[PDB]
Amino acid sequence: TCPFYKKIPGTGFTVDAFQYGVVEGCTAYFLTHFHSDHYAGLSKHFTFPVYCSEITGNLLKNKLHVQEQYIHPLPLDTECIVNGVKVVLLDANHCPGAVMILFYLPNGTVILHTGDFRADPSMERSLLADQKVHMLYLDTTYCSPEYTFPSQQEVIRFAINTAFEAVTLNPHALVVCGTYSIGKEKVFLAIADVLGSKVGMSQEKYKTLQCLNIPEINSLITTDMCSSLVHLLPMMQINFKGLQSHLKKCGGKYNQILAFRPTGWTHSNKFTRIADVIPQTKGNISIYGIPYSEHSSYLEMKRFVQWLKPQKIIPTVNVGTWKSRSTMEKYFREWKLEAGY
């Protein structure tokens, strides 16, 4: 049954709560973003009202075949009413169409649900500034001090300079970028732009990208593998084996691959600065592991919560073991001591 942490007290609302069948007392289902753990259970057979961003609504319609009559898209940074309750959607700095939701409760309580987010100081100057937030439902994916990572921009700059060099040294080289769902599109679009190329990809992935309201999108992507010097493949195919195989299917247009695997965090974040990164090479194939995260580092999360000063915190990630629950509680206590709220 639907956990307490996916229900908003005093409303008929749930968030990201689609895998329990019909939730008793829910008059509206909110969806923060289009990742499968969050939308799990939604299909053409769903017949209740779903609220979400415009981008998320395009993906539900076109990828999950949710009928249009049940989809209610809302604009961002805009005061809206849903079943008698004032709400605002804000940009979550996560994947395309990902949102945080501010609910203004009839009793005067204000609740912020972050969805999945990567905290940034620009959120300290949004509509969140205007009033006191009482409860925070927090994306706690990396809530532990060992989780450090560079900025998105540092990683992108590295990937650009690395690709430009390789293809200038060898213009018959091919750049490949791993992907598995939406997110991290900036990695491949930024590289394709420095090389002055479109990005080539499968039909399925091209369709997904067409849902994301990217301006000038038709000038940036293609299914033509032969005209194109950046290709996308699934993350699991980014190994020497799978890259050699792919190279054999471009029709003798390229003789080399440089590939990127933008991953979350792994054990080599503690030591290696982005400037120190070197690839694994086998013959005419090179693979770079780059830590491109769409979730808050420990320090980014701590700063955000210390600025916001919520009266109560409810975690939404790593909540299934008592050990994680207990550990996260200890960090929230500390954060509250040190900042005095």
Residues that bind Ni ion (CB under 5 A): 35, 116
Structure tokens at 227: 């005209």
Question: 247 or 301: whose CB is closer to Ni ion?
Answer: 301
In the complex, the smallest distance separating the C-beta of residue 291 from Ni ion, rounded to whole angstroms, is: 17
Question: 40 or 129: whose CB is closer to Ni ion?
Answer: 40
Sheet hosting strand 99-104, strand order edge to edge: 80-82, 85-91, 99-104, 110-113, 135-138, 312-315
Residue 330 sits at the vertex; the CA angle it makes with 341 and 142, to the nearest 5 degrees, is: 100
In the complex, the smallest distance separating the C-beta of residue 275 from Ni ion, rounded to whole angstroms, is: 29
Question: 14 or 93: whose CB is closer to Ni ion?
Answer: 93
In the complex, the smallest distance separating the C-beta of residue 37 from Ni ion, rounded to whole angstroms, is: 7
Question: 139 or 305: whose CB is closer to Ni ion?
Answer: 139
Question: 116 or 185: whose CB is closer to Ni ion?
Answer: 116
In the complex, the smallest distance separating the C-beta of residue 145 from Ni ion, rounded to whole angstroms, is: 22
Residue nearest to Ni ion according to CB distances in the complex: 116
In the complex, the smallest distance separating the C-beta of residue 124 from Ni ion, rounded to whole angstroms, is: 22
In the complex, the smallest distance separating the C-beta of residue 174 from Ni ion, rounded to whole angstroms, is: 29
Question: 183 or 200: whose CB is closer to Ni ion?
Answer: 183
Question: 19 or 281: whose CB is closer to Ni ion?
Answer: 19
Q: How crowded is residue 129: how many other Cβ atoms within 10 Å of its Cβ?
A: 10
Residues paired with residue 101 on neighbouring β-strands, in sequence order: 89, 113
| Cα pseudo-dihedral 153, 213, 47, 81, rounded to 10 | 80
Three-state SS at 30? strand
The CA-atom distances, in angstroms, between 62 and each of 30, 34, 71, 183 are: 18, 12, 12, 17
Three-state SS at 340? coil
In the complex, the smallest distance separating the C-beta of residue 108 from Ni ion, rounded to whole angstroms, is: 31
In the complex, the smallest distance separating the C-beta of residue 113 from Ni ion, rounded to whole angstroms, is: 13
The stretches of 105-254 forming alpha helices (DSSP H) are 152-169, 185-194, 203-210, 240-247
CA 336 to chain CA mean position, Å: 28
Q: Let me know: does 101 contact 38? Beta carbons within 8 Å.
A: no
Residues paired with residue 100 on neighbouring β-strands, in sequence order: 90
Contact residues for 47 (Cβ-Cβ < 8 A; gap 6+) = 67, 70
Question: 142 or 254: whose CB is closer to Ni ion?
Answer: 142
The whole-angstrom separation of Cα 229 and Cα 172 is 9
Question: 114 or 197: whose CB is closer to Ni ion?
Answer: 114
In the complex, the smallest distance separating the C-beta of residue 74 from Ni ion, rounded to whole angstroms, is: 19
The whole-angstrom separation of Cα 208 and Cα 228 is 19
